[PDB]
């Protein structure tokens, strides 16, 4: 994820841009990479806060879905943290109490319910953690250049 | 087996439970009557 | 009066840690307490 930013911010700053017939190049961000890409706040300020303006303001336009896809990924990401941080022991106990309610109303299932395996819980998380991460910067990359 | 998991000692009508519930229910209808400007 | 901060800040950052960690380390590594 740092490789794609090192490509994204540099080319916008140093390479990609508009050139005049005289020979003067006006890059997209104007050489901010030189002095701002040496501090973590500069990446937070000049790359994430600045270039994401088109995404949040995409509502009511053709790029409005990118604003949604940029956001729905954040949900899917934090949803990963359920399965990584937690453990099956909690979840099977909770399911046990819920099974009693179905036994009470005689809606008990034949296939007895079971919590997800330990390896699966780690698996389901990284699936969400990555899907939420990649899908986030996917829309941020799209809407930024599609406007610029 | 010292403690029964299930409770015992109550009849079908449940007079004591229903009496306090209807009171809590009546006051709820009262506050609604003030909201609807009935009173 | 501002000279007190010049003497109290460093001892809090240097002297007190060095004294506490040095005592605590030798205390926990002691064989008989």
């Amino acid at each position: 994820s740092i490789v794609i930013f090192h490509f994204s911010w540099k080319m916008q700053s140093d390479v990609w841009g508009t050139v005049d017939a005289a020979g003067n190049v006006s890059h997209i961000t104007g050489g901010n990479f030189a002095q701002s890409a040496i501090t973590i706040n500069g990446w937070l300020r000049d790359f994430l806060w600045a270039q994401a303006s088109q995404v949040i303001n995409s509502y009511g336009s053709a790029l409005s879905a990118y604003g949604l896809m940029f956001l729905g990924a954040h949900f899917v990401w934090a949803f990963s943290l359920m399965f990584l941080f937690s453990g099956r022991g909690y979840w099977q106990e909770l399911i046990e109490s819920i099974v009693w309610a179905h036994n009470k109303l005689k809606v008990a299932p034949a296939i007895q319910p079971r919590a997800l395996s330990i390896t699966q819980g780690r698996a389901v998380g990284v699936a969400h953690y990555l899907l939420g991460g990649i899908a986030t910067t996917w829309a941020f990359f799209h809407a930024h250049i599609l406007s610029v | 087996k010292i403690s029964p998991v299930a409770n015992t000692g109550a009849k079908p009508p449940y007079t004591f439970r229903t009496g306090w519930a209807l009171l809590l229910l009546a006051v709820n209808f009262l506050v609604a009557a003030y909201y609807f400007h009935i009173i | 009066a501002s000279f007190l901060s010049s003497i109290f800040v460093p001892v809090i950052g240097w002297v007190v840690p060095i004294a506490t960690f040095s005592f605590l380390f030798l205390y926990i590594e002691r064989e008989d307490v």
Binding site: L105, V107, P109, I111 | K1, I2 | -
Partner: protein, 137 residues
């Protein structure tokens, strides 16, 4: 409340109706939408704010959709319960949950048009102390 007014008196609703943003393929879908939302109450934004108080005047806001769900929802649950209990009598119960026996399910799915009539009829919904009680307390 909260500076809530009817639609036509509100100038905001009058302006938003011009900017149609036709949803469907019909060209006049945008105008027909705003005209239909004239019945509701509009705030300073011009967006209709629905009152779910329970007023019979505003019953279409919450009351009518509310009943439409519960009739559908009880249809789904009552069908699933009867199909599940019906499977329990047969020999291999676990397999039918996966590979559905349509001979049993589709008659049950046909029913449920009147689930409350059947529901009140079953004063015994299977509840007893014979369930999973699961260490002493």
């Amino acid at each position: 409340g909260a500076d809530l007014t009817p639609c036509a008196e509100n100038p905001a609703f009058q302006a938003l109706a011009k900017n149609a943003r036709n949803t469907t393929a019909d060209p006049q879908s945008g105008q027909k939408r705003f005209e239909r939302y004239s019945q509701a109450l509009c705030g300073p934004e011009g967006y209709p704010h629905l009152i779910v108080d329970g007023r019979l005047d505003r019953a279409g806001d919450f009351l009518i959709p509310s009943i439409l769900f519960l009739y559908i929802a009880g249809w789904i649950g009552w069908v699933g319960r009867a199909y599940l209990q019906a499977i329990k009598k047969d020999s291999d119960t676990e397999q039918k949950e996966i590979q559905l026996d349509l001979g049993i399910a589709l008659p049950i799915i046909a029913t449920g048009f009147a689930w409350p009539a059947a529901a009140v009829k079953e004063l015994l919904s299977g509840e007893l102390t014979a369930k999973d009680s699961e260490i002493t307390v």
